């Protein structure tokens, strides 16, 4: 009952969650550890 | 390119949801639930007037910003060894400022025709209010985007001419005329927007 | 229906505004720095 | 010489084949009276009195093939004349 | 086994049935004979067009091909999208259809069509002159021609495959290799003969057996074939094409 | 193109203007007529001081020599390139890093076998070709240890990635230095081509053809040359770069080639460089095959200059400036030699 | 006598032979597709170009039929 | 009768008609506008010949004008919502035709101006391909004209 | 009996029909023009032969227009509910067919132009491919017209 | 009194079927043209042999043609609303299966291109793998027409 | 009696104004600060005159509090739904106008500081560009003041 | 006349405020920390002059946190929903202005650390920019507090 | 009477706190640990000093647990819809604040261990940045607590 | 998150230990920290499974 | 010639979808029970993507 604004609220929460999880997934998939000056010893 | 790729991801997701709901609209017998007439009758011209003015100024300003930077950096990079360039090439910045001026003139012309309504009933109330608001954000969209495009074109061609000046300054005589065409694009947007405001009123 | 149109006005208009600001943000972050100077 | 055979042989072939099939089509429009199995199209909007005026139309439309065949024959004659210019 | 004496024929007819057009075949043969006439001329003639060289090198193909194409167009009664009126149509007359409890629906027919249900009692029967031209007008001709052409194409393919595979026997006997016969050729003929000759006899039997009067509850060959292939046999709800076929 | 202009100009206007202006900064043809008309080294100083170049012979030896002319041309080149590379940005900076890595591998092969042999490393410093930089450590004062340089150059020096192919410390002695340089040149070149293709804009469009030309021409010249050496055809195909039209076809005929005529036929498969073949007069007082190759390079450099939203303009300036230095020092050489019948081995660029 | 290799040889040959027989019997239907193609293109081009020969014109019908006729003739060939 | 605020679709049609022509003509005067400047240093004698694409991009903008002013002229309060749809379709069509034309003009003009910079005799053929670009723009215009008068 | 304003669908149909055709035409023109603009210096005798693909793009543009004007002739608010979306479907059909034709013609023009630049004889095969692209466009028109009149 | 908006489950089905055919075929010609330009610079005797994949670039257009005009002819004023869903199915089915086939045909065209540069004998294997591709399109035609008659 | 959420829109107007102003100013400081931080190793004497871009960025900053406080102290809950939307639009427009001004100014500052670093001559024209950027920001402001009460 | 769910606006305002404060602080600290880590290798004495940005990142944290506690001080279930509007707007708004600030600070710090390596007097310019942009942090905070109390 | 989901926004607060805290601690641990394992090669005698950033990564995770367990202890079926929103904001707040703190901690820890691999004196500045990061984490903790009990 | 950190620190530490066997102990400890994060996750999971 | 066998397995992937499509065509009718049609949907999706 009175869904007409609570569904908008759920939409806002869901897009906030999507933004956060997307940012973290982008920065965690593509984290930049340096990976230098010793990588040749292990290759 | 990952970030813009995620932007395209949300784009395609939005369109996917759109097609899904569009089909399910007629699958499950949704009886004209998206009443477009309800939407139009229930909207307000305050959105439309303020959109017109704000978008006009917005887009004129950012177009002028583009022109300002491209011309300015081209000129000061060229002047490092050929300082004579600026003495003839600084006028392009005045020109993009004039583009912004045209946009602002449209902004005031559109501000000429904004007023409150404070009415509740939609039916037969404010019939021409809708018409005038439609005209208003139409004019704002037109002016703003036209000024964007004049700005980018003027900026890049100005940079090209500015660093062509570096080798032979006599070429500035037969290259500056390019800006006239973009100015025609600006004054065209002005004419169409004037006609948009010419025969409109809120009632 | 299936929504509240009263705030749906603000929703769609604000979404247009945030799309324009999204273009603005793509351009504002398009900045990126330079290397050493020439001397 | 002028308008050699290398570019008029096409006109010759086209004219000959055209006269052939238009005489066949005129024969099928005036003798068969353009039976509908062979020719559905017809130019009337009111035929509720009888089939006689539809027959008159069948001769009318078959009349249109005579001018066709005759001036294709003229074109073929002119093409032969162009060819003979050697 | 040189396959020239078999391709030399079957390639023509298969192009011709894939090219079932009368006047187009006529034009193709006209061009082919035009090349035939000037053979000795072109042999003492120098040109650079190499597609033209590959075609007059293979003129013996195209002339015979075009002859069979004309003949196939004669089958289909399709000379430039039209049919020749032999006037053997035996489908409808005035007193018959009015005698089928009908009259003056053509007053309302200005907006409608009114397909006639079959079995009038006096019409039908064979058309010796090929395809009856009446279909060319009917807009439901698609169903008739689709079923027809699909079935004959499948059967022609079956016949060609079954004939062509038999040359492996000539190979096996000429080279005194019955080792390729024992664990080879024989089961091959077995499975193909069963799997496709069964379908052939099925369609022949259906065409010879059932009429439009028994159209209700009439099965289809598709459903029978898939039921056989799937191991699925319902206990009822679908009558056999013949007794004991399970 | 589609992406640039709105984004090119923002961070490339300065460098585009700079390459245009420094194309204009080369010696004018009137200056060249001044160069040939003095036939003396003191006057050579006199009028090079009066042009864009010159005014750089201060604090130099009173007996002006040709080597000084070479040094000043090369100093102008390296100064202009330090000017361009100092101001750069990750894509184009990386591009210019590639432009420099060729000379890097050259100088690095100069450094190697200065330490397998018992020679000083301070001895090596003044002899490096310019642009070499080598401000990075672990390669200096190595105590004449091959493994120390091996690890120094896998670890510290930026071009270590290409030495993943040159490994095991065995090739240092058993194998030639020059063949090692050739493997590194190939591997680096193909890596550069792949980097160019990754940036799929007009950069890729303008840099693909010239890299294919360079691969094709180097395979062409090397195939001509090694008819008088000890090398088999499969080890031969091993070291031809993959990034060339030849790899589709033309490299096979070069492998089959054994003399001047098979390679002539290879040139004849492609009209573009057949023309470069028939310009191989090699006459005493004219240009040679290598000069026609440099001429075609010059033409492609002009073609790169025509376009303006890519990065091949800087490579074009590289090749043109190298040709220009070759011209000016050659003129100085023939002025000192006093032999005016043989001044003609230089290619004016602009 | 390589038992395994020859066994696999015969196995692949039988598998491909049977499955190819099935796929080839399916592929024969291209005949049907092409026959449909010839038919359909014939009547559609007829109803498009040469159908315009019908018109109420009593004198200029054939006269325009000239270029209409040449048009479909070159097109159809 | 005329339903409530029936004008809307035409009110947006004029805007679309002019603004998408603003994208096409702007790109057209951008591309050649920069390429001509790049060429001018080497040889200025062909500069006015090379200007030809720019004014033609202006002509694309003029097509936009004609459609827009037609829509505005027919724009009134008593709109049947039939002509409003006609105007919207016309504006979108002509605008995006101008966009396609502007892109083709810009790229072909840059390629052509540098090509003629290398060799003079290609100028007229360059202008032929450029004329074709305007032919496409004209088809866009005439479709919008049909809709504005329906 | 008929839902009102089915003619909007025909309006958007004619629009889309010329839209996607114009897109394809611009795509073909850009590529072909840029391709010739380089190599007319080295093979100027092929300048006359180079017109063959661009007029093919022009045929695509023509096809866009002819469908647009057909739908305009058949457009009316008094549609029986069964003829306006026909215009919509046919317009989308033919337009994007023109788009595909422009794609193929432009890229094949790029490949074949340097093909003939090396060796003059390759022209005939190139023209064969151009013929095929046009055959595709023709099929698009066939089905489009069938839906247009039915 | 059939439901309103009924015939368009036929119209859009036909349109979409030929839409995807148009995409697939054009991509086939794309890759074929690039490949033939590559081959014929060095192997002229293989030109007309490499024209062979080009003819199979067109069959994707032929299959979609068949299905499209079958749907067109079978479309009527009022539908039973059980055949039109079959038309939508079959259209999308054959169209996108053919688009996949067209991708495969273009790229295997490139494969045989790079194949026959040294050894003309590979022509036979090229054609063989090429036959393996269009069988999918014919399969799609099979199921599409089974639905169109179901 | 007024529709709900009336003050909410004014609060967003203030928020939009100040955000875009802060974004532009932070951009200006970021780019100018990198330029000044790294350049002054070689020409330290320009350090006391590079504050001009910094205070120019500050002035682009300042356009916030004027409009933002005009909102903050003049905002109420009893609005007729007309004022609040005006403040929303005005805040947005002036804000992102200032954002664009800063987008120009920071990068102008870096390019300018390097330019004057080479030679002191270009400094006057560089500052000329900066003042034009401030004029742009002021345009945004004056329209904001128009919408404050209009 | 207060719609329910009013606590949501206030809590999300305070949340988003300290959220964005933490984000900006992390940016500044992380950038400056990498800089100072790679710098004290060769001049340890610069630590006392490279840690001021850390202090001012702390100051931004204090900004977000005073905002958070202040908003929390005026929160309950049945708020009027007219003050919570300001709470939400300001809470988002000041915090994201802090993002802009601290991001610019971290960039300028990355540059200034390397700037002051060989030339100690650049400390003055470093601090000159550093105080300035944090005054812009305050700039935002002013409107933050004014609306938090309005 | 009570709106739906009114006893569950706190559940998602606890969830989000755990989410963003786990992401943060994991990222910081990975980033610092890479550098730690790098500099263990040449200086294993400082591993214990380089354990310290990982210890505070654990500690900021403990902050996340304090919020999570308190929220779990402050949940039941009959919530009045405002403590639930409070705990939602609290949990997401603290979680992502710990996330950004862990980001900064990790990257600065890698840089710091790189730097201190030549000089253990840099440990003092490393600890200075490090502690401040958990000060930020503590601030997020404090706001989460006050909201969870408000 | 725990597995993510565990994998990265483990790869780094096992690579580092490929030169120095001592690192093994410290590497394992760095992993222990992430498994303590896992402990936290299971603790709250237990709370909500018995709530 | 012996490297065609993976292509034969590709043809087998082709016959698969046809088998299932014929099954669906069999069990399809006009007024389906409304709980077989989704089974057909899922079957087609599953077999087709497994073929993928």
PDB file of C-alpha atoms in Angstrom, chain K residues 35-143:
ATOM      1  CA  UNK K  35      52.065  23.470 -13.265  1.00  0.00           C
ATOM      2  CA  UNK K  36      53.460  25.805 -10.609  1.00  0.00           C
ATOM      3  CA  UNK K  37      54.709  23.025  -8.326  1.00  0.00           C
ATOM      4  CA  UNK K  38      56.770  21.433 -11.044  1.00  0.00           C
ATOM      5  CA  UNK K  39      57.890  24.414 -13.141  1.00  0.00           C
ATOM      6  CA  UNK K  40      59.478  26.634 -10.524  1.00  0.00           C
ATOM      7  CA  UNK K  41      62.660  24.564 -10.236  1.00  0.00           C
ATOM      8  CA  UNK K  42      64.023  26.436 -13.281  1.00  0.00           C
ATOM      9  CA  UNK K  43      62.329  29.888 -13.172  1.00  0.00           C
ATOM     10  CA  UNK K  44      61.557  30.539  -9.490  1.00  0.00           C
ATOM     11  CA  UNK K  45      61.015  34.238 -10.225  1.00  0.00           C
ATOM     12  CA  UNK K  46      57.559  33.578 -11.709  1.00  0.00           C
ATOM     13  CA  UNK K  47      56.235  32.150  -8.432  1.00  0.00           C
ATOM     14  CA  UNK K  48      54.818  35.438  -7.142  1.00  0.00           C
ATOM     15  CA  UNK K  49      52.987  36.195 -10.418  1.00  0.00           C
ATOM     16  CA  UNK K  50      51.492  32.723 -10.895  1.00  0.00           C
ATOM     17  CA  UNK K  51      49.049  33.536  -8.096  1.00  0.00           C
ATOM     18  CA  UNK K  52      46.938  35.240 -10.761  1.00  0.00           C
ATOM     19  CA  UNK K  53      45.457  31.964 -12.098  1.00  0.00           C
ATOM     20  CA  UNK K  54      45.032  30.881  -8.470  1.00  0.00           C
ATOM     21  CA  UNK K  55      42.936  33.912  -7.512  1.00  0.00           C
ATOM     22  CA  UNK K  56      41.138  33.702 -10.872  1.00  0.00           C
ATOM     23  CA  UNK K  57      40.114  30.194  -9.827  1.00  0.00           C
ATOM     24  CA  UNK K  58      39.159  31.674  -6.466  1.00  0.00           C
ATOM     25  CA  UNK K  59      36.917  34.209  -8.180  1.00  0.00           C
ATOM     26  CA  UNK K  60      35.262  31.394 -10.126  1.00  0.00           C
ATOM     27  CA  UNK K  61      34.832  29.889  -6.677  1.00  0.00           C
ATOM     28  CA  UNK K  62      33.194  33.011  -5.221  1.00  0.00           C
ATOM     29  CA  UNK K  63      30.157  32.932  -7.532  1.00  0.00           C
ATOM     30  CA  UNK K  64      28.787  30.247  -5.200  1.00  0.00           C
ATOM     31  CA  UNK K  65      28.165  32.010  -1.854  1.00  0.00           C
ATOM     32  CA  UNK K  66      26.328  34.916  -3.463  1.00  0.00           C
ATOM     33  CA  UNK K  67      23.724  32.707  -5.151  1.00  0.00           C
ATOM     34  CA  UNK K  68      23.936  29.970  -2.507  1.00  0.00           C
ATOM     35  CA  UNK K  69      23.197  32.391   0.337  1.00  0.00           C
ATOM     36  CA  UNK K  70      20.541  34.090  -1.787  1.00  0.00           C
ATOM     37  CA  UNK K  71      18.981  30.630  -1.721  1.00  0.00           C
ATOM     38  CA  UNK K  72      19.812  29.741   1.862  1.00  0.00           C
ATOM     39  CA  UNK K  73      18.425  32.789   3.654  1.00  0.00           C
ATOM     40  CA  UNK K  74      15.549  33.386   1.210  1.00  0.00           C
ATOM     41  CA  UNK K  75      14.344  29.766   1.069  1.00  0.00           C
ATOM     42  CA  UNK K  76      11.166  28.877   2.946  1.00  0.00           C
ATOM     43  CA  UNK K  77       8.474  26.174   2.911  1.00  0.00           C
ATOM     44  CA  UNK K  78       5.490  28.195   1.678  1.00  0.00           C
ATOM     45  CA  UNK K  79       6.358  28.376  -2.028  1.00  0.00           C
ATOM     46  CA  UNK K  80       3.832  28.396  -4.890  1.00  0.00           C
ATOM     47  CA  UNK K  81       5.850  25.674  -6.715  1.00  0.00           C
ATOM     48  CA  UNK K  82       7.096  28.446  -9.057  1.00  0.00           C
ATOM     49  CA  UNK K  83       9.989  29.985  -7.143  1.00  0.00           C
ATOM     50  CA  UNK K  84      11.596  26.698  -6.079  1.00  0.00           C
ATOM     51  CA  UNK K  85      11.960  25.373  -9.626  1.00  0.00           C
ATOM     52  CA  UNK K  86      13.409  28.733 -10.686  1.00  0.00           C
ATOM     53  CA  UNK K  87      16.071  28.437  -7.990  1.00  0.00           C
ATOM     54  CA  UNK K  88      16.744  24.847  -9.079  1.00  0.00           C
ATOM     55  CA  UNK K  89      17.306  25.857 -12.694  1.00  0.00           C
ATOM     56  CA  UNK K  90      19.316  28.950 -11.801  1.00  0.00           C
ATOM     57  CA  UNK K  91      21.590  27.100  -9.402  1.00  0.00           C
ATOM     58  CA  UNK K  92      22.239  24.416 -11.993  1.00  0.00           C
ATOM     59  CA  UNK K  93      22.913  26.848 -14.831  1.00  0.00           C
ATOM     60  CA  UNK K  94      25.230  29.216 -12.961  1.00  0.00           C
ATOM     61  CA  UNK K  95      26.953  26.328 -11.247  1.00  0.00           C
ATOM     62  CA  UNK K  96      27.947  24.317 -14.270  1.00  0.00           C
ATOM     63  CA  UNK K  97      28.731  27.559 -16.090  1.00  0.00           C
ATOM     64  CA  UNK K  98      31.326  28.139 -13.380  1.00  0.00           C
ATOM     65  CA  UNK K  99      32.400  24.522 -13.784  1.00  0.00           C
ATOM     66  CA  UNK K 100      33.095  25.161 -17.465  1.00  0.00           C
ATOM     67  CA  UNK K 101      34.942  28.356 -16.547  1.00  0.00           C
ATOM     68  CA  UNK K 102      37.216  26.407 -14.205  1.00  0.00           C
ATOM     69  CA  UNK K 103      37.565  23.678 -16.831  1.00  0.00           C
ATOM     70  CA  UNK K 104      39.058  26.365 -19.029  1.00  0.00           C
ATOM     71  CA  UNK K 105      41.024  28.166 -16.350  1.00  0.00           C
ATOM     72  CA  UNK K 106      43.150  25.433 -14.774  1.00  0.00           C
ATOM     73  CA  UNK K 107      44.499  24.152 -18.080  1.00  0.00           C
ATOM     74  CA  UNK K 108      44.896  27.734 -19.333  1.00  0.00           C
ATOM     75  CA  UNK K 109      46.941  28.339 -16.204  1.00  0.00           C
ATOM     76  CA  UNK K 110      49.284  25.419 -16.777  1.00  0.00           C
ATOM     77  CA  UNK K 111      49.793  26.193 -20.466  1.00  0.00           C
ATOM     78  CA  UNK K 112      50.330  29.823 -19.519  1.00  0.00           C
ATOM     79  CA  UNK K 113      52.865  29.182 -16.776  1.00  0.00           C
ATOM     80  CA  UNK K 114      54.945  27.042 -19.120  1.00  0.00           C
ATOM     81  CA  UNK K 115      54.649  29.706 -21.825  1.00  0.00           C
ATOM     82  CA  UNK K 116      55.854  32.501 -19.566  1.00  0.00           C
ATOM     83  CA  UNK K 117      58.492  30.110 -18.230  1.00  0.00           C
ATOM     84  CA  UNK K 118      60.089  29.940 -21.666  1.00  0.00           C
ATOM     85  CA  UNK K 119      60.007  33.738 -22.167  1.00  0.00           C
ATOM     86  CA  UNK K 120      58.177  36.493 -20.240  1.00  0.00           C
ATOM     87  CA  UNK K 121      56.596  38.035 -23.354  1.00  0.00           C
ATOM     88  CA  UNK K 122      53.410  35.948 -23.598  1.00  0.00           C
ATOM     89  CA  UNK K 123      52.283  36.694 -20.032  1.00  0.00           C
ATOM     90  CA  UNK K 124      50.028  39.638 -20.912  1.00  0.00           C
ATOM     91  CA  UNK K 125      48.038  37.684 -23.495  1.00  0.00           C
ATOM     92  CA  UNK K 126      47.842  34.754 -21.100  1.00  0.00           C
ATOM     93  CA  UNK K 127      46.231  36.966 -18.452  1.00  0.00           C
ATOM     94  CA  UNK K 128      43.946  38.304 -21.197  1.00  0.00           C
ATOM     95  CA  UNK K 129      42.642  34.762 -21.701  1.00  0.00           C
ATOM     96  CA  UNK K 130      42.157  34.429 -17.941  1.00  0.00           C
ATOM     97  CA  UNK K 131      40.070  37.601 -17.646  1.00  0.00           C
ATOM     98  CA  UNK K 132      37.877  36.443 -20.519  1.00  0.00           C
ATOM     99  CA  UNK K 133      37.292  33.233 -18.553  1.00  0.00           C
ATOM    100  CA  UNK K 134      36.197  35.320 -15.570  1.00  0.00           C
ATOM    101  CA  UNK K 135      33.845  37.242 -17.870  1.00  0.00           C
ATOM    102  CA  UNK K 136      32.273  33.910 -18.853  1.00  0.00           C
ATOM    103  CA  UNK K 137      31.720  33.054 -15.200  1.00  0.00           C
ATOM    104  CA  UNK K 138      30.197  36.482 -14.635  1.00  0.00           C
ATOM    105  CA  UNK K 139      27.729  35.852 -17.469  1.00  0.00           C
ATOM    106  CA  UNK K 140      26.603  32.731 -15.664  1.00  0.00           C
ATOM    107  CA  UNK K 141      26.244  34.752 -12.472  1.00  0.00           C
ATOM    108  CA  UNK K 142      24.158  37.535 -13.992  1.00  0.00           C
ATOM    109  CA  UNK K 143      21.674  35.053 -15.395  1.00  0.00           C
TER     110      UNK K 143
END
